[PDB]
């Protein structure tokens, strides 16, 4: 037992991280087969960052302007092209450590692991949720761009995120691996705002089930609510509506604990209205929404 | 910016994980050079688990009784020996993926990454602190024994923990890699209690500095306290005494923020006496003590 925020093992992704330099800008790239993927803003300069024309900037580049380093070995760039907000650098060597992989785009409310990297060297791994407002609450410093987010299923790495920028509020924005931004963000040197965020209700309920499985039961009660009466309370506290699909997704956890989803919903209503009265749930004094039902089943089955 | 619980990249340790089976018990082992390390309780049975004589149990074993599997390859055991509560299985092949490593024992209050593994296959990575009472609050299921904890410095893996057991309270106990338990625990099938725990004061202060660096300032005040007056409050709330060495260790963070350690101590006193009044610090509604000063400097420099 126990319940911890838990990342996927990062080895398969570590073997794909390289350093990419253009001019005086260094960031990370992802080396899969004979292509290195990185943020296109590597080609921007201080003179042209407020609103770059990236098409013009790339036309003016040559292969030799890109310095790609895999550990202590320079990789020769033999082609370059733009893919939305990502650059694809074709190199003369296929990465021998290329895992089985896919490029997936994730939905708000889903989680993934981030391998934070600097100068092409992995520094740390943590778990993040894609927020309803298409930001992530990460931990990224200067030089972290090109760090990626991923999930692993069997032996296959599903890449879902590449890091591009930090918003004024200190949250993070980036793209899928096709170079399409999550959310209404653009890769220029401007202060941009995310939409209003909301709490991921289905995840809060999953975490409450995790708590029960781990022996935290104080917040349980004999009451049940209707889906509609619950959603009335949800709206009031800036929680997303709970749907029948969510109820279905929570089915395994409901079966394991013997607590119906609408029974647990009555607990959540009570916690929203009354707070915790000095108590904690799984070591937290607030309601946690960055664990999916899948994440819970992984540690609690 | 941002501040997340962050594990070390796990690749170097992933390349060392194997499966060890004796009889009907399967758990994990750590394969370094030509030795596999695992918990000695792999040789216990349901008939003899309340209080095994491990010396007798090992005398009755042969090399062929140990089945060691590295991925899809059986490793031939050519020697076996006991090292306190660890078994050392000499194998006929040196692990080609052996990193530079050390076996260190850690102190209470220090952190490390855990690579949770089942059937010799890495499942997840998370960060833990060694508690004052020599337990860890981990996430471990049946089959997780032999999973290891570690820190990485440059290219060198410092192994500090191997997992052996779960206490009745749901916290975890294990050994260093020399097979010596952390705390007053023994590897038998009995319910054992840890000593009373305490809060790691120096870590709480480090995390408060992290918060300031990340723009959380509401808990700051114009007051300073003496070390002795602070320790009077610490004792009252089951916090460890703060020492001058701790003040010194916090020096870089104090310099970075311009807030003297004894200034921050006045904030901590106020938070202990008054609570947060509905507010949060770095996304938490309680005071967090599982980040060391080093951990903070890593994400906040
Ligand atoms: C890439 O390494 C870097 C990562 C940032 C640095 C600090 N923490 C991070 O996550 N990205 C950037 O610096 C990106 C590149 C640009 C898209 C060109 C701009 N940028 C921003 O993060 C950026 C610029 C800017 C201006 C005003 C307010 C916020 C703001 N963010
Ligand atoms: C090893 O895979 C396993 C890991 C446990 C299983 C559940 N979560 C974990 O962390 N270890 C054990 O099962 C160890 C082996 C023994 C030392 C022989 C006993 N054991 C315990 O964890 C254990 C036995 C026992 C009895 C009564 C109360 C608690 C208790 N823990
Ligand atoms: Na109920
Ligand atoms: Na103060």
- Residue B109: DSSP 8-state: T
Pairing of strands A100-103, A156-166: parallel
CA of A166 to the centre of ligand 1 (A): 5
Q: Which residues of B touch A (CB under 8 A)?
A: 1-12, 14-15, 115-116, 122-126, 128, 137-141, 166, 170-172, 214-215, 280, 283-286, 298-299, 301
CB proximity list for A28: less than 8 A, separation 6 or greater: A17, A18, A19, A20, A38, A117, A118, A119, A120, A143, A144, A145, A146, A147
Which chain A positions have a beta carbon within 8 Å of B170's beta carbon? 1-2, 214-215
The answer to whether the CB of B281 falls within 8 A of the CB of B264 is no
Confirm or reject: Cβ of A144 under 6 Å from ligand 1: yes
Pairing of strands B17-22, B66-70: antiparallel
Q: Which residues of A touch B (CB under 8 A)?
A: 1-12, 14-15, 115-116, 122-126, 128, 137-141, 166, 170-172, 214-215, 280, 283-286, 298-299, 301
How far CA A16 is from CA of A7, A251, A284, B55, in Å, comes to 17, 37, 35, 46
Which residue from B10, B126, B166 is facing A5, i.e. has the nearest CB?
B126
Q: Please, what is the end-to-end C-alpha distance for chain B in angstroms?
A: 9
Confirm or reject: Cβ of A187 under 6 Å from ligand 1: yes
Q: Which residues surround ligand 3, an ion (CB under 5 A)?
A: A 221, 223, 263, 266
Token pair of A278 as six digits: 């000095």
CA of A261 to the centre of ligand 3 (A): 9
How was this structure determined? It was done by: X-ray
CA of A291 to the centre of ligand 1 (A): 27
Ligand nearest to the CA of A144: 1
Residue B80, SS3 per DSSP: strand
Which residue from B9, B123, B214 is facing A124, i.e. has the nearest CB?
B9
CB proximity list for B103: less than 8 A, separation 6 or greater: B158, B159, B160, B176, B177, B178
Cα–Cα distance, B242 to B265 (Å, whole number): 10
What's this structure's resolution in Å? Answer: 1.4
- Closest CA of chain A from B96, distance in Å: 15
Which of B135, B142, B166, B190 to mutate to test ligand 2, by most ligand atoms within 8 A of the CB atom? Answer: B166
Residue B254, SS3 per DSSP: helix
The answer to whether the CB of B194 falls within 8 A of the CB of B219 is no
| Torsional class of A149: left (φ above 0), alpha (ψ -120 to 50), beta (otherwise) | beta
Match 């990502």 to its residue by tokens.
A86
Q: What is the residue with the minimal CA distance to atom 24 of ligand 2? A: B189
Ligand nearest to the CA of B205: 4
Cα–Cα distance, B53 to B55 (Å, whole number): 6
The β-bridge partners of A248 are none
Match 């840890």 to its residue by tokens.
B194
Would you call B164 a catalytic residue per the annotation?
A: no
Which residue from B4, B9, B140 is facing A10, i.e. has the nearest CB?
B9
Q: Please, what is the end-to-end C-alpha distance for chain A in angstroms?
A: 9
- Closest CA of chain A from B10, distance in Å: 6
CA of B269 to the centre of ligand 4 (A): 9
Confirm or reject: Cβ of B44 under 6 Å from ligand 2: yes
3-state secondary structure chain A: CCCCCCECCCHHHHCCEEEEEECCEEEEEEEECCEEEEEHHHHCECCECCCCCHHHHHHCCCHHHEEEEECCEEECEEEEEEECCEEEEEECCCCCCCCEEEECCCCCCCEEEEEEEECCEEEEEEEEECCCCCCECCCCCCCCCCCEEEEEECCEEEEEEEEEEECCCCCEEEECCCCCECCCCCCCCCCCCCCCCCECHHHHHHHHHHHHHCCCCCCCCCCCCCHHHHHHHHHHCCECCCCHHHHHHCHHHHHHHCCCHHHHHHHHHHHHHHCCCCCCECCECCCCCCCCHHHHHHHHC
CA of B70 to the centre of ligand 2 (A): 24
Would you call A160 a catalytic residue per the annotation?
A: no
The answer to whether the CB of A187 falls within 8 A of the CB of A226 is no
Instruction: Tell me which of B28, B71, B126, B153 to substitute to probe the interface with A (most A C-beta atoms closer than 10 Å).
Output: B126
Task: Look at residues B107, B102, B101, B139 and name the one whose alpha carbon lies nearest to residue B123.
Answer: B139
From B145, B160, B265, B300, active-site residue: B145
Match 């960052």 to its residue by tokens.
A49
C-beta atoms of B7 and A126 within 8 A: yes
C-beta atoms of B4 and A139 within 8 A: yes
| Torsional class of A191: left (φ above 0), alpha (ψ -120 to 50), beta (otherwise) | beta
C-beta atoms of A9 and B14 within 8 A: yes
Q: Which residue in A has a C-alpha nearest to residue B128's C-alpha? A: A4
For chain B, list the domains and their CATH numbers.
11-175 (2.40.10.10), 201-300 (1.10.1840.10)
Which chain B positions have a beta carbon within 8 Å of A298's beta carbon? 123-124
Which of B45, B49, B164 to mutate to test ligand 2, by most ligand atoms within 8 A of the CB atom? Answer: B164
């Amino acid at each position: 037992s126990g319940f911890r925020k838990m990342a996927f093992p990062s080895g398969k992704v570590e073997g794909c991280m390289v350093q990419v330099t253009c001019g005086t800008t260094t960031l990370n790239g992802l080396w899969l087969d004979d292509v290195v993927y990185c943020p296109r803003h590597v080609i921007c300069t201080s003179e042209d960052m407020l609103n770059p024309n990236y098409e013009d900037l790339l036309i003016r580049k040559s292969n030799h302007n890109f310095l790609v380093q895999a550990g202590n070995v320079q990789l020769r760039v033999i082609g370059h092209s733009m893919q939305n907000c990502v650059l694809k650098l074709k190199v003369d060597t296929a990465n021998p450590k290329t895992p089985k992989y896919k490029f997936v785009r994730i939905q708000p409310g889903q989680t993934f692991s981030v391998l934070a990297c600097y100068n092409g060297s992995p520094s740390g791994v943590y778990q993040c949720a894609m927020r309803p407002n298409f930001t992530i609450k990460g931990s990224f410093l200067n030089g972290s761009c090109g760090s990626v987010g991923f999930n692993i299923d069997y032996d296959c790495v599903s890449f879902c995120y590449m890091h591009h920028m930090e918003l004024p509020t200190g949250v993070h924005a980036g793209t899928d691996l096709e170079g399409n931004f999550y959310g209404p963000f653009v890769d220029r040197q401007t202060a941009q705002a995310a939409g209003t965020d909301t709490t991921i209700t289905v995840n809060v309920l999953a975490w409450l089930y995790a708590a029960v499985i781990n022996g935290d039961r104080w917040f349980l009660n004999r009451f049940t609510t209707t889906l509609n009466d619950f959603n009335l309370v949800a709206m009031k506290y800036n929680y997303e509506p709970l749907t029948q699909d969510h109820v279905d997704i929570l089915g395994p956890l409901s079966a394991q604990t013997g607590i119906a989803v609408l029974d647990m919903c009555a607990s959540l209503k009570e916690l929203l209205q009354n707070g915790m009265n000095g108590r904690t749930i799984l070591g937290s004094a607030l309601l946690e929404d960055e664990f999916t039902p899948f994440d819970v089943v992984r540690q609690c089955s």
